Amino acid sequence: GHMNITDIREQFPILHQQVNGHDLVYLDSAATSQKPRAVIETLDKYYNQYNSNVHRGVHTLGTRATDGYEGAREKVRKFINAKSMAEIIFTKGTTTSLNMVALSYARANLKPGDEVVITYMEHHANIIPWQQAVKATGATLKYIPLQEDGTISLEDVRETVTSNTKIVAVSHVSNVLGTVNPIKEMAKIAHDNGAVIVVDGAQSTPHMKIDVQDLDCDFFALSSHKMCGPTGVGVLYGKKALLENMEPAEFGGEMIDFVGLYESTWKELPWKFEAGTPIIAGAIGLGAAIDFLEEIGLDEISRHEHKLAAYALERFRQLDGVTVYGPEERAGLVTFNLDDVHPHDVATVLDAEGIAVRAGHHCAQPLMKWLDVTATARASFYLYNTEEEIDKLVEALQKTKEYFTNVF
Amino acid sequence: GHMNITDIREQFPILHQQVNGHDLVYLDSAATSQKPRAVIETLDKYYNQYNSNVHRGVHTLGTRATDGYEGAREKVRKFINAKSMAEIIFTKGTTTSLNMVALSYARANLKPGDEVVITYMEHHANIIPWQQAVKATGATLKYIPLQEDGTISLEDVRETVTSNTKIVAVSHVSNVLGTVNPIKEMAKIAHDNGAVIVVDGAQSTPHMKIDVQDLDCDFFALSSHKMCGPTGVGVLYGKKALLENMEPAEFGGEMIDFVGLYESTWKELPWKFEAGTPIIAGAIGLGAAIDFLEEIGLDEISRHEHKLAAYALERFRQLDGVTVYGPEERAGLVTFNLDDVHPHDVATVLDAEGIAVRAGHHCAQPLMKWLDVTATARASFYLYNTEEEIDKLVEALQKTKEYFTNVF
Ligand SMILES: CC1=C/C(=N\Cc2c(COP(=O)(O)O)cnc(C)c2O)C(=O)O1
Ligand SMILES: CC1=C/C(=N\Cc2c(COP(=O)(O)O)cnc(C)c2O)C(=O)O1
Structure with missing residues (x-):
């Protein structure tokens, strides 16, 4: 124990x-974490023994690399208790994950009169993509105020969130105050007003259990480099019914099904949101970091x-x-x-x-x-x-x- | 020798x-290349000895990691003979680099009547972002035709490119036909018509010298995983005068200078285009791949x-x-x-x-x-x-x- x-x-x-x-x-470690030999030797065994590009139906090393990459996707799904691998997208980090939600969800679902609600304690990665999305759409950005010890009261959340609010975006844990925000109760308030909740989990994921079914968050973002894993990789979790209706943020090989001269169609989730050759070694190393932290508890x-x-x-x-x-x-x-x-x-x-x-x-x-x-x-x-x-x-x-x- | x-x-x-x-x-190796021990031991020494987040004015390991990351940016500038580190942006790969040009340059510079010109031999990463950008702007996509042996003739380029063309995007080398396209002469034709040229260098960079001053390309994109370097990292080169006038593709920490509640201002190049914690280990490993390939020639x-x-x-x-x-x-x-x-x-x-x-x-x-x-x-x-x-x-x-x- x-x-x-x-x-x-x-x-x-x-x-x-x-x-x-x-x-x-x-x-x-809130700026970046250090890595154990179990993760560093994961990257070495990948480049020494089975590196190859990923895909169904290829040669022996390519099958080993694909089983490694999609194996790591299942370890992530189990680690945050998502219902499906279709809801787990690999990205380059928390910041890219929140930009994908602001480009593909908010720019498609905001119009004048609509509000995005955030908080004064948010990191820039969970402020600037929303400033840019409300600018593009003509919507309004609003801030929930803080209590004097740097906590959020649920009364102030109810006061700020209205029936014109479409998105509430909030940190799970602040990287400056150390506050753990009441995300599960904030999600209830957002949903009761007709809005989705986007959670920035970069500082919570490394340091406490995450269960997205119990939190009921609509989107959740995290970074490998803060949780004993390689740099350059992160996850965006989204509920499957919301990702199904969002367009891709980037376009290219691997995320298509048919490409004609002028029009194309996309692959099913989660690959619809992963364009180009993926972050193969880094995602396999993040799976080893998950295995390491789960063995400790x-x-x-x-x-x-x-x-x-x-x-x-x-x-x-x-x-x-x-x-x-x-x-x-x-x-x-x-x-x-x-x-x-x-x-x-x-x-x-x-x-x-x-x-x-x-x-x-x-x-x-x-x-x-x-x-x-x-x-x-x-x-x-x-x-x-x-x-x-x-x-x-x-x-x-x-x-x-x-x-x-x-x-x- | x-x-x-x-x-x-x-x-x-x-x-x-x-x-x-x-x-x-x-x-x-056109799907992915294998790595030498010089690159794999570069990643190991980074995670065993000096991993930390990057920034001016921090503690001893953070200074070593920053000198490593910006050191690798200078090795990339010298390797493709760009004039300045402000023109070298680290990304997750060729596909993301070409999507940044289509989001930040083409969506800002196309209107009805304007044309984007591509070729029938292009990879999907250099087709779909343009299909999406002309759709968003109301512009037209056109294809240069091929000769019977799968080469491009400069007469067909001149015929397809017009004074309504704003962008020509073309592969340096095809990953299927093996053709080396005449990029330097195509750039002259684009410029003489008032257009910029975007070059997809994913298959050329690993296998032949690149000199972007001699090619005179306006943008050039490449991937580490094809040229003996780590997965999950690539470069976008752009001429400094064009990047200065483009808005960022993603927003967050590290790419800002001042953040107010509703409006922010951005950092100078190249950091304006690098949001969040960077791909630290992978970029340092790409610098070691460059050193390895330059020592061979x-x-x-x-x-x-x-x-x-x-x-x-x-x-x-x-x-x-x-x-x-x-x-x-x-x-x-x-x-x-x-x-x-x-x-x-x-x-x-x-x-x-x-x-x-x-x-x-x-x-x-x-x-x-x-x-x-x-x-x-x-x-x-x-x-x-x-x-x-x-x-x-x-x-x-x-x-x-x-x-x-x-x-x-
Ligand atoms: C250098 C540095 C980055 C830091 N924060 C990473 C971070 C981020 C950005 O994650 P990134 O894309 O991995 O840099 C978003 N939200 C929270 C709550 C964060 O902690 C930090 O505290 O120190
Ligand atoms: C699995 C596979 C990817 C391949 N191509 C990578 C590539 C790409 C995409 O680069 P990526 O973002 O690193 O996947 C763009 N243009 C050319 C000419 C390319 O060769 C390939 O030939 O086989």
Whole structure:
């Protein structure tokens, strides 16, 4: 049952090195995660033994590669509990998945008077495609407001969503506040108003179980690179009845059935939405990442991260002059600022002690404006991090504070 | 100077195995190429040592990954002799690159009366995005006709292209006929009529030197998986003055400069066209494939493939009852049919002898209709193939012919 962190860290070769003469402390898994040998050796065995293009009815290596690629599609369907492989589309990442929904669903289903509803805590990937789609259609964009601790109340959702709302798009978990939003209840409110709900699951999928039947979301998007898998690949899930009626976002080989000089017809789902040679190795590697995380247990990973987040919030409250943003109940990250030290300089001095964090707006400029700052620092955690690494981070922040005070 | 094929094959681990009790003979590099250890160990060193998300001004591993990703962009610029890294955009593959030109350039620059000119030998990736763009704009699609040996004459180009033509899109090399089209002279004809030229370089880039300044093409697209590099990545080259005036195809983080609630502004080139976390490992691996092919020499690879194609065409002319399609002067592939044996069954029986070829329409249904067949078989070559492998293929075709005659 209970995960052993020593034995998990032993499977990630990149953790065992020094930076600037200190052991690496990597606390930037919300920007990207590190990979275990089970995934890296999956990519190696594919390119060393059975790489070939994918299709029905070809030679021996081509059949092995096709069985690998469509095998990985079934592992994804089981991992988020979708009803069918026709609802699982491989893309290059969360951002491309949400752009496909805005191009193929929203640009076809919006007209003047219609509304798209989003929230002030959304990442840019779940803001800009909607700004562009309402511009193209003459519709209206509206924002749900936040409570003072950076949570959403269902009363404010009901107030913002109306019978003119056609789409509500919302993060499952914020990559800055750590808030877990009440998606299942928000889906009920959208459906009761006649709208669909589009969920950005880039920060939830790596760190907690997803069940799209229980959430009842109409679309759900995620990225491999945040959940121990290769870069350059992601998924778009959509309910089959909505994908059946959407046109493709891109056109070419593999997604057609018949091509004449002027007109063509498309393949059935899910291939209708996969044009060209697919991301073969990366999707097979994402299937190996899923197998790896399922063998550990997503509920075990969630419980470890609950322990690390509770420990970090307590230890941050021990520091004078430090502000943390967002709620007490949260996922495994802390975004903060020191009084009087710019967050870029915090991240500079921490990297000189071996500690990797990120500073900036975290692709959420409207949220930074809501918080009344121009930038923040963020430490974010995953299954290979430990309480001793959080002690290193809070000791380094104390020394940073004393350093800049001495400078001034 | 002169390539040693023994020493090149020793670097591709996948070539050294048996299929169905016979040494593998892989003759399907136009569908995808195999990779050398220099590229596979590039991906391993990235995930074992320096994976992190990319950006200016971050921690030590993030700086190494950013220097790797933008380093690979400069290797691509030098490899096709573009003037600037602002003209080199990383995408998921040729098909996505041509869809970006059709969405962001053609849908903005076509109106009724305007024409897009293509050719009957084009792959579907360079047909369907134009069918869709002329549909959206009310413009007209026109085809340049072919000569009887599957070449294009510059007189027919001048006849088809007019002062109402705005875009000419054409393959550099056909993945079925093996024809090398006269792109530099076609670009002159397009420009003299007021049009831009879009070149599909998926089959030329792996196998011959590309110089986009000498070709004077306005856009050029290519795929990593055909040129010894990872799956899931490709390039779109465009002249800087045309990209500056095109809007992005996808929207999100990394491609913005300022994001307000309703309106945003974009980053400079090339990042304006790269939304979200990039294909970090795959682009670094494509840079290693470029370094590998440059150390061998693309002119040396082209000369090897000229020798293999001349040898194969002679040996095919020794077989009774076999038709080869396309011209005598050609790239390194042969597409053919046996009289009275369906090409699917040819590829079935060849794979039982260890030999991998492909049968079907090769994503070029209008060309198969021009050729008056419904499908063909294709053997295609690259730097690791040899004359002995072509002998195996022609001996297996003789035995296939005798087999089916005996059956009947
Ligand atoms: C460098 C960086 C990207 C980050 N976010 C990825 C992301 C994305 C974009 O995913 P991507 O297309 O894989 O970059 C969308 N929504 C949420 C909630 C995200 O966390 C981040 O937090 O730090
Ligand atoms: C399975 C298969 C794909 C093939 N073609 C890739 C290709 C493509 C599409 O490139 P992709 O997006 O990498 O699949 C466009 N133009 C030409 C001339 C091509 O050769 C092929 O010949 O066999």
